[PDB]
């Protein structure tokens, strides 16, 4: 029937993934000779808890992560005109992007699956709840409290993974309307760290949150 | 007994033919869409926390959907109309609560039921913590919080959603719960984010609840 | 001498296990054409906590389940007079029994291993901590508080898994004598339910507990 | 040259582990025909917490399991004089030894790796935290509180696994000097249980602890 | 293009890794005849909490670990002038270093990947959160409170793993300034114990922290 056509479609996809994944061992990840740029952005959904005793604060957000590999690339025409597909994040390489301030291991609130597009670009969007070092003090005043946490590669250097932001403006469109706390400013600024011990740049994306109780 | 051996063999052969012989289903495509039906059975509201503005639910979430590739003729399979299977042996939809502040906990064995026409019924029971403002939970009107459920990585063109009723199922609601239910609904909506020209469905659970005075 | 003889038992069990399990395809589970019965019963060790705020109660108990598979059947003479063995519960089908009204994922206190006997009967004894839905009002009256939780197949009906008890009363023989909570009465009894929607039976074992604070 | 000798010793160890484990099948565990004796002893590090609300107490201890199997036995002469080796607990059979009266799944504080000796004897020293049933009353009394816990096989009778202790003396030499509770006495004693229902013996080691606040 | 050398540099790395990890079976560990020296160092980040009912304090640090394996060496000129690479820590052997006085299974805050360099050296930098045994009494004094915890191999003696520090000074450059507690002193110092049971030495690196509130 028109049944036959949906099968054809599955097969082009079952075929496309196999060619991508099962016909090379694995992407070793980026190197100084193959570099990689990861674009970060944040949508801040909530500030759930501010804790004066430990000076820890707990956020819920979605971290948009975007990077392009030549190793995932295909002619849609060879594959039934498939321009993209969804797949398990465990089937691909994902950058090691970590907060440098976490006081507790991140918890993942969303299915780990990513979108891969024929030009070789991957867009992964993990929702996470994160506890990090923050001093809430002033959160009950009208000026509020100010906290910052940095994100970047844990193990690579600017020569292998670089970070980039589409905007310095964190996305509040989805922020919880009734959250215990309200948001004055949120911004995401890319920076470069240097260390005396080394000749390389270490990039990070700085999240600054300015909030107070409703 | 004699025939018991056969029924056994008939089932194993069926699952071999569905799963060993045929590869992993790649999931829905723009050219091979799904529709997942949602319904909720609310069982308890366990805790309301106004420090963090978080509420905890226990419910059963029913998911039903259909794949041709799970389809078979009972007469080659010894009149097997349906069978129960581990959920890991099949593709399941990546359906997530959009406002969860803690990773969902699963309270039930994860197994599903597949019927000869290719339909799957999956009914996971969960504890969810989502963003809710309890204010007014001690008062006659109660409080109103809502949470949405949708695919995380797929748009309406690939995974679509419907409900059987807009009425959430309260027949199992624990009668001594600290909170009593004033109303519970599950409603299907579509949103556009115009970064993209295609629909995003979600099922919206709205619950109004009140401390049980008694 | 007898070291060498003990070495033969070891190879016989190794071989029984190999013949049963990975020389046989994974058992599909019960059918309506191949049904089974699970016998359930509880040994209640502790009432750990009763939360008046969230209305949930934490129990510790060992849950005895038994069932009999024909596929696990064997003749002890072909296998060296081996009548039974301990095995990893991951190595065999186990039933889907679950508490119907828990508020948290159940926690296993015990290694998970099962005993397999040559008639194909299996005994499994998970020790658990369970938070179920409970209103601990009156815990401080001589009348005490009463809560109940049901266990049963989550995905199978009475036509694939029948469910039952050996005795109708929870084993209190191991109950912690210094827990904050005394037990007035503890019950486990089978019930069968039907639904309007569907014509087939759903069995469950209903566990009912009455408890006081310890004076 | 000095290296080759370092290199050659690795080859010898690798060779032995291969002969021992992947060459031979996984040991099924004890039988009534192949009984096994497990030696238990405790080193009590800390009493972390006592909850007089729920009546549970929290210990941090190191448990020393030791046992022996001919299957692990080797002649060091064929192994370049290798007497012993360290390995992960996954690579070998371990007794299923559990606290009978725990209220919480045990948390393992140490890397799980054991020591096998050429006479076929394993020594396993897992560091754990345990929450078990204890009623604290008196802990602020000179007399102190006494609680007690049993350890033994969850699934095996005295006919498959027998228990012993090297000594009856619990080792307090590593106990935390500044712990909230000072230890009064601690004893580890072998017991054997019988049931009317069944003919066979169940041993256990009963750990008894008398403690009070500092 | 220059997508080639990118392609070839990528090809060279996969070849190197397979030549290390798939030529020869995973390495057996150090042995008295193939001993190993691990260098430890600590970057202390935050003291997150001090619980004085249980006497437990919580640290967030990054432990630096280095060791050299002959079996990890290669010749850059055979491998494309590659001088080092980043890899998952699961692919390679790692030492059993742990905290001797922890009260909870330690938590891992960072992606676990290590840096392997051509001379066979590995740098691993786990970020951890540790709850250990600490009597915080005095934390409100001018003097503040002093606590200590030891680190070292769990199963390995000094004959197989030795410990070393580059400096006896913990690295406070990353310490969180708005942290609830101030750091008066921090030292990491090699010690060597003889345990009476066993003939050989067991070194540890003793972490000493003097901190107070404010
Ligand atoms: Ca870094
Ligand atoms: Ca979305
Ligand atoms: Ca049901
Ligand atoms: Ca027992
Ligand atoms: Ca030690």
TrEMBL record, chain B:
Disulfide bonds join 132-145, 195-196. One of its GO terms (molecular function) is identical protein binding. Mg(2+) 6 binds at residue 192. Mg(2+) 1 binds at residue 6. Mn(2+) binds at residue 6. Keywords: Calcium, Metal-binding, Receptor, Signal. Residues 23-210 form the Neurotransmitter-gated ion-channel ligand-binding domain. Mg(2+) 5 binds at residues 158, 198. This is Soluble acetylcholine receptor. The lineage of its organism: Eukaryota, Metazoa, Spiralia, Lophotrochozoa, Mollusca. The gene is LOC100533247.
């Amino acid at each position: 029937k028109d049944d036959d056509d949906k099968l054809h479609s599955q097969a082009n996809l079952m075929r496309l993934k196999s060619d991508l994944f099962n016909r090379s061992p694995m992407y070793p990840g980026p190197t100084k000779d193959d570099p990689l740029t990861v674009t970060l952005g944040f949508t801040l959904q909530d500030i759930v808890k501010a804790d004066s005793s430990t000076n820890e604060v707990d956020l819920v957000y979605w971290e948009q992560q975007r990077w392009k590999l030549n190793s995932l690339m295909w002619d849609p025409n060879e594959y039934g005109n498939i321009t993209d597909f969804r797949t398990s994040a465990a089937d691909i390489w994902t950058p090691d992007i970590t907060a440098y301030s976490s006081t507790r291991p991140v918890q993942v609130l969303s299915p780990q699956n990513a979108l891969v597009t024929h030009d070789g670009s991957v867009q992964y969007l993990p929702a996470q709840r994160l506890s990090f070092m923050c001093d809430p003090t002033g959160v009950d005043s009208e000026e509020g409290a100010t906290c910052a946490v940095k994100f970047g590669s844990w193990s690579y250097s600017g020569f292998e993974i670089d970070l980039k932001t589409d905007t310095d403006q964190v996305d509040l469109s989805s922020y919880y309307a009734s959250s215990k706390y309200e948001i004055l400013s949120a911004t995401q600024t890319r920076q470069v760290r240097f260390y005396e011990c080394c000749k390389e740049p270490y990039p990070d994306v700085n999240l600054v949150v300015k909030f107070r109780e409703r």
